[PDB]
Amino acid sequence: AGDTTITIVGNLTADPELRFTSSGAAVVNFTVASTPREWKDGEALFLRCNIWREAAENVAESLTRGARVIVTGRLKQRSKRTVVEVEVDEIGPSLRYATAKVNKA
Amino acid sequence: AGDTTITIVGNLTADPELRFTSSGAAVVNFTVASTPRIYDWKDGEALFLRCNIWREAAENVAESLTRGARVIVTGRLKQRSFETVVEVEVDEIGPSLRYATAKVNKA
Amino acid sequence: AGDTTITIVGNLTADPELRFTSSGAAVVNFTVASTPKDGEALFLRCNIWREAAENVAESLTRGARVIVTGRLKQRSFETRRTVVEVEVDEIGPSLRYATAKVNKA
Amino acid sequence: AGDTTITIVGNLTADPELRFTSSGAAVVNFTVASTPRIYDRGEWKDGEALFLRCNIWREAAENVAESLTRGARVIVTGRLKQRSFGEKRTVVEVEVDEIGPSLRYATAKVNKA
């Protein structure tokens, strides 16, 4: 029934925006700034991603603005206007230019 | 220096419209209607992704595909300026033989 | 859990191997030759079943350029090992260098 | 011209193994244990574990060695290569492009360079 999956590597434009909903389900919305083609150049891409629950909490606690992340999910369309968003499936900080102490839970 | 590659499986919303550009390069723009099936089964809302395929690959698509067609599309996400949108820079495309057959003609 | 999905583009090394089971279920096994002209060819084995399998067998032939999606799987030939295969989910002929007449079912 | 990029999510089977080469250029080899969760009747079912060998080079390799440990849940992107390991057997590996720790079950203190 058709589907989509995407992987992107980019930087958070700002610190993780935490909130909750009527359930008590943790929601974070953040944008990844990715610029294609380090040599040459592209035209910056801004993708909005949404991550939910446990994962959302951990994201908020761990990542900050400018952070270089690796994101996976599907594409989703927002609502007379449409916008493409990412239903984050997994996300983590790229260890290409950084280190991290990891804490299991 | 991030980057972003995507793969989608959908149906063309309409026959491929072939066009061109200042250089000569054939250009085809089309939309893929993809409807993800969720956990609960449930068929969540339809997605409409615009895809651009250029040069020869574009020509072949225009010749081969028609509306309704179930396709398999790979590429990268790109933004065009508003005042914006997300589009696919198709890298490869082809008709999913999940519900059909095809007579393939190399060049 | 874990994401083991993959998409690949290559050519079929040979005409697809149709075949059947006690059930009467169709199984095709074929190999995709992909070269990452920086290279060194990669040979992935792919298995596709039922209806889709039948369609492939009828449509595709050796040398064919295809677009394949599925998950990596690991199979047994464990002597003195394990091999990686693709559980094809969707497959089509890449229109990059060819045309095709579609005919839905 | 072929496309062999892949993304996987799994857990390191063991602590990252750092080593170098003729150059002094760093190299890490590790394995990711991924187990897909297959659906039939329905009801979840796991399914046979996959073990993919990944190689990551240079500064990224150093960072990995310093940050990650065995059991760690990672997100790896890269390309599949074939090498030559019945006498000369062949084995599919990942040329890691980008890697990081999945924040799905954990937090991390990130520190740039």
From Swiss-Prot, chain B:
Would the keyword Transferase be found if you checked this record's keyword annotation? Answer: no
Keyword check for Nucleotide-binding, yes or no.
Answer: no
One GO cellular component assignment for this chain's record is: nucleoid
- GO BP of this protein: DNA replication
Q: Where is the SSB domain positioned along the sequence? A: 1-97
The organism's superkingdom is given as: Bacteria
List the Gene Ontology MF annotations in alphabetical order. Answer: single-stranded DNA binding
Q: Which UniProt keywords apply?
A: DNA-binding
Subunit organization:
Homotetramer.
Protein's name according to its UniProt entry: Single-stranded DNA-binding protein
Which organism is this protein's natural source?
Mycobacterium leprae (strain TN)
Q: Which residues of the full protein are shown?
A: 2 to 120 of 168
Swiss-Prot record, chain D:
The record's keywords, sorted A to Z, are: DNA-binding
Could you mention a single GO BP entry for this protein? DNA replication
Highest taxon, organism lineage: Bacteria
Molecular functions (GO terms): single-stranded DNA binding
User: An example Gene Ontology cellular component term from the record?
Assistant: nucleoid
Give start and end of each SSB domain: 1-103
What assembly does the database describe for this protein? Homotetramer.
Q: What is this protein called?
A: Single-stranded DNA-binding protein
User: Which gene carries the instructions for this protein?
Assistant: ssb
